[PDB]
Each structure stands twice: as structure tokens, then as C-alpha cells.
Amino acid sequence: KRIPRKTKGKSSPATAEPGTSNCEHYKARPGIASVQKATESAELPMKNNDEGTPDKRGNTKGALVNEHVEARDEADDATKKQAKDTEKAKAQVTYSDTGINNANELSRSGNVDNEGGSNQKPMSTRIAEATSAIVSKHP
Amino acid sequence: LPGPDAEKWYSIMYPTRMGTPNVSKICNFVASCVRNRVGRFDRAQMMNG
Amino acid sequence: MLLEPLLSGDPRMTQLAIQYQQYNGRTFNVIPEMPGSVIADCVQLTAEV
């Protein structure tokens, strides 16, 4: 009854017991808590990729970056997080600086809209000037 | 186009966009013009996004 | 997330599938056989009403 919702909606002779007398004398040989610690991390779901997508307004909510430059930089970002989660200074499993050329790499940057053009101005903006190009005042 | 000024540019760029309310010479001309020949009509996409 | 990365690069589309070529152009295409929807036909029902 009455379940709360996380996301915004709209505007927003009795017993002699021969059974158990418990006393723990067994150790979990891998360990329960270790598998709990690992399986919580595995329980963490997939991280969203918000980038390059239209927002509620329409404008693509990605930052002003070059797409190959961001695609090279995201390897550095996940590499630094890899070094943080291995807790060593050099991330041994790195995602960049290999010998394998990836110059045609492209990621989903906010430089591009859905039509395939630049996103220097917002598109709600450029439609606002598109209709401001035709008005007529009082005679 | 980029830059702050974007208002009168569409009038100066796309002459067939306007209406032709009267018998002004430019209005007779824009009424004599054809219709489906303004704007984007051919793009060359290679990749998604 | 649900359905969000489809929102890039003309999401006007019909049905989706994934494929791969080996080396001489043998593009192995795998198309999922689309089941019928339960939201969409009710949208059709209320549109018919």
C-alpha cells in the first residue's frame, strides 16, 4: 500500500525442540563477505552514455569538444580511473598510448546535431532567429 | 550562419521565403518565382552521429 | 537509460540489426524477428477510437 516513486511525475507441550541448538563451528572457506564485496561491484549496473543526445529542449547536451579529441581523452579518463581502482600510479591496463593506430576514431560528441551540422549555436536559438526573420509590427 | 547577427540574414539570403501581399514589383517577382528551390536539398552522410 | 543512444543521427528508422563481414565481404547479417508490441497496438486502438 502507498508505494513511493523515485522519479518526478508530470509537473512535479508447546515446544521441546529436538531440532536446533545452534552453535557455529564452520568457516566459509572462500568467505561470504569477500564474494559479497565483489558481487556488489558486479551488481553495479551499466553506466549511461548521455552524450550527443537531444535534451528536453532539443539541443544536443554534449560539451563543445572535437570528437576524435574526446575519443582519445576518454581513454585517458578511464585510464586514470583504472589507476585509481588498481591503486597504483600507472594504470597497467591502459586504454590509450598503444602501438595500434586509431586515427579514424569517432565518439558521440556534442559538436554535431542530428542533421549533421555544427552546434556552435543552439538549435532552439537558431529556430528563434529563423522565425524572428519574419515578423510585422503595427501600422 | 555563425555570429551574433542572424535576423535579417534570412531575408537577404532566401528571397522566395516572403509572402506576396500586394502588387509591388518585388512581390510580383516573388509570386512569379517557383517554390521548391530554397534550402538544403542534398546532403552526403557517411556515418551515424 | 533506456533507448537513449538511438537518439543520434536520424532516428527516423524502421528496424534494427547488427552485422559483420569477415574479410572477403561475407557480411553475416543477423536480424531479430520482431515480436508484436502491446503498447503500440493499444496506441493504434485508441487512435482508431
Which of A60, A59, A52, A54 lies closest to A124, judged by CA? Answer: A59
| CA-based end-to-end distance of chain C | 32
Residue C32, classified by CB atoms within 10 Å of its CB into exposed (0-12), middle (13-18) or buried (19+), is exposed
Chains in contact with B via at least 3 Cβ–Cβ pairs below 8 Å? A, C
Q: How open is the CA angle C13-C17-C21, to the nearest 5 degrees? A: 125
Give strand pairing partners of A54. Answer: A60
Farthest CA pair distance, chain C:
53
Q: Which technique?
A: cryo-EM
CB B49 within 8 A of CB A108: yes
**A78-116 core/surface letters (b: 16 or more CB in 10 A; e: else):** ebeebbeeeeeeebeeeeeeeeeeeeeeebbbbbbbbee
| C1 with A114: Cβ contact below 8 A | no
Which chain C residue has the Cα nearest residue B45? Answer: C9
CB A62 within 8 A of CB A123: no
CB A87 within 8 A of CB A42: no
CB A74 within 8 A of CB A96: no
Q: Which residue has the cell 542530428?
A: A114
Q: How far apart are CA A86 and CA A80, in angstroms?
A: 10
**C-alpha distance from A32 to closest chain C C-alpha (Å):** 32
If you ran DSSP here, which 8-state letter would residue B16 be given? G
| B45 with A116: Cβ contact below 8 A | yes
Give strand pairing partners of A60. Answer: A54
The dihedral through the CA atoms of A69, A72, A78, A81 has a sign that is negative
In three-state secondary structure terms, C6 is helix
Q: What H or E segment, with its residue span, contains residue A34?
A: helix A32-43
**C-alpha distance from C10 to closest chain B C-alpha (Å):** 8
CB C20 within 8 A of CB C13: no
In three-state secondary structure terms, A54 is strand
If you ran DSSP here, which 8-state letter would residue A60 be given? B
Give strand pairing partners of C28. Answer: C20
Q: How far apart are CA A53 and CA B39, in angstroms?
A: 25
Cβ contacts (< 8 Å) between B47 and chain C: which residues? 9
Which chain B residue has the Cα nearest residue A112? Answer: B49
CB A91 within 8 A of CB A77: no
Q: What H or E segment, with its residue span, contains residue A74?
A: helix A67-86
Around Cβ A70, how many Cβ atoms within 10 Å? 20
Cβ contacts (< 8 Å) between B49 and chain C: which residues? 8-9
| C-alpha radius of gyration, chain A, whole number | 28
- Of A118, A120, A133, which has the smallest distance from its Cβ to B10's Cβ? A133
CB A54 within 8 A of CB C10: no
**C-alpha distance from B29 to closest chain C C-alpha (Å):** 37
